[PDB]
Amino acid sequence: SLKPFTYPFPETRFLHAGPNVYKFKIRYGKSIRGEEIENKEVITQELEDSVRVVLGNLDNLQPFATEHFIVFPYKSKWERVSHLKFKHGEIILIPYPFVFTLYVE
């Protein structure tokens, strides 16, 4: 159960999966920005699905098509993360060292 994505505005989301914390960025392309979608629950679900596919293919990112979007996922180094510490209660969470950017078109 994730909070809604702020479609069609870009956002940064921190996600906890297993023992790691992941940094995700969502960006929307020219076309998908000009036209807007009214029922965002479907869109939020497609974006969660897209995040889950990226997490399921961390070592082999590839573009894919959802019902409404083409998603081009990319990783880049998560800079200035070495001086940060994440906890879930007493549990130490490890930041995944790459930012994932989903270029939604």
């Binding site: 921190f14 596919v53 510490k85 994440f86």
Partner: peptide
Amino acid sequence: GYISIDAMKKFLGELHDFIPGTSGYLAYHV
């Protein structure tokens, strides 16, 4: 033509928003 999301492997486990100050999450610097 791009591959359908429905053909791809998917992480199906628990997935949560990491929000410090809620659900026991905390973050800080040195």
